[PDB]
Design a protein around this ligand. Structure first.
Ligand SMILES: [Zn+2]
Ligand SMILES: [Zn+2]
Lengths: 147, 125, 138
């Protein structure tokens, strides 16, 4: 994991998962695995911090990239098989406020919840106030609308 | 004997031939009135240590404190507990879980694993 | 002594003038091999039904010993190289290259089952019905 986060081996392309219950270590590097990016949190506090954001605002003229952000090792790519074993927390809010809460060992965080929706699911405002099939119906109709 | 006993006679499903390295099978000695175990592909033979040759079901080898390795203590997804006392070591904090098996038996009961390197002890409550 | 401030240093040599290839012959300890009772041995490539590609046949004491089959290693290493280190009377170490790893396993003696008589047929009829008598009638 330290080696991957160091970007010595390709990240969205070497997925690594351990099943501690069976005493096994499985690794994958074939094509076609679906994975997503996540903010790594360490010990109990988020690993991304203010200097990185200051670089992203500066990126408007100074040379910088998302790739730099990954090379800092604050963000990672996680595939569905690894995602089975992580302890992923919804928001920095919960991970900080967490004092008397039940969990205490989060290992990744969402950059934001609204990223779970497709591209058509993204046009719609407040999809969370709508009965879910109403929202499936819009995803079909948007593709029919003209402009 | 006594009601407060146990049935682990030592089911020796393994006792291979000392020569051809294959499995021994029961066979009768009527002459000596003794069970013997012989390899089929050769003459080698040796007496048994038990009168048993086969058992089935126990129905309740509730199987509560086996297979499950202490190292499961490391898994971040398992719930750490503020509930105290490793019945072995004078230290609180244990990971716990349940069944995790398809012969779930209906065992809703919790299993607790001590997490500090001093025990690796695995009890139940 | 060993339980004190013991320090020892040995020179290590890797000669290039060697011409003989160095190989590994591996056994299971569970097989209880006893070199002390190996009076004589043969070792020949054996695949007469089908030189450098061939598996080995190891024959100890001939008709009055055990026989083994030697199988080639599953592949060359991809990072390290196994070396044999020997102690020399002068007080140095001497290191030798491994050319190959062969695995040797138990063959059996004159047992001879032979399923060609009618045992494939007998099996069709078999209800785990017999076991001893068929081995004898051969
Ligand atoms: Zn035998
Ligand atoms: Zn303990």
């Amino acid at each position: 994991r330290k080696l991957r986060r160091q970007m010595d081996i390709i990240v969205s392309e070497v997925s690594m998962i351990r099943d501690i219950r069976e005493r096994e270590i499985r690794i994958y590097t074939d094509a076609g695995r679906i994975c997503r990016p996540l903010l790594i949190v360490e010990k109990q506090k988020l690993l991304l911090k203010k200097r990185h954001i200051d670089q992203l605002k500066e990126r408007e003229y100074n040379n910088y990239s998302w790739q730099d952000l990954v090379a800092s090792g604050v963000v990672e790519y996680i595939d569905t098989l690894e995602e089975e074993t992580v302890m992923l927390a919804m928001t920095p809010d919960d991970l900080q406020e967490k004092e008397v809460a039940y969990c205490s060992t989060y290992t990744h965080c969402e950059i934001h919840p609204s990223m779970i929706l497709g591209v058509c699911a993204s046009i719609i405002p407040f999809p969370d106030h709508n009965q879910s099939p109403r929202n499936t119906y819009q995803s079909a109709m948007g593709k029919q609308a003209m402009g | 004997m006594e009601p407060d006993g146990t049935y682990e006679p030592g089911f020796v499903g393994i006792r291979f031939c000392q020569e051809c390295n294959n499995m021994l099978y029961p066979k009768e000695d009527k002459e000596n009135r003794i069970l013997l175990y012989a390899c089929r592909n050769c003459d080698y033979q040796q007496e048994a240590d038990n009168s048993c040759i086969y058992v089935n079901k126990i129905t309740h080898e509730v199987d509560e404190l086996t297979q499950i390795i202490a190292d499961v203590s490391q898994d971040p997804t398992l719930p750490r507990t503020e509930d105290h006392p490793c019945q072995k070591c004078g230290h609180k904090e244990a990971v716990f879980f349940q069944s995790h098996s398809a012969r779930a038996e209906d065992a809703m009961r919790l299993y607790y694993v001590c997490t500090a390197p001093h025990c690796g002890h695995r009890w139940t409550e | 002594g060993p339980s004190s401030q013991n320090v020892t240093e040995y020179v290590v040599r890797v000669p290039k003038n060697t011409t003989k290839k160095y190989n590994i012959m591996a056994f299971n300890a569970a097989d209880k091999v006893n070199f002390a009772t190996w009076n004589q041995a043969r070792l020949e490539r054996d695949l007469s039904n089908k030189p450098e590609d061939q598996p080995w046949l190891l024959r100890v004491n001939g008709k009055s010993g055990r026989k083994f089959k030697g199988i080639k290693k599953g592949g060359v290493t991809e990072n390290t190289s196994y070396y044999i280190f020997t102690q020399c009377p002068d007080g140095a170490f001497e290191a030798f290259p491994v050319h190959n790893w062969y695995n040797f396993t138990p063959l059996a003696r004159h047992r001879t089952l032979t399923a060609e008589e009618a045992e494939e047929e007998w099996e069709r009829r078999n209800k785990v019905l017999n076991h001893f008598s068929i081995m004898q009638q051969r």
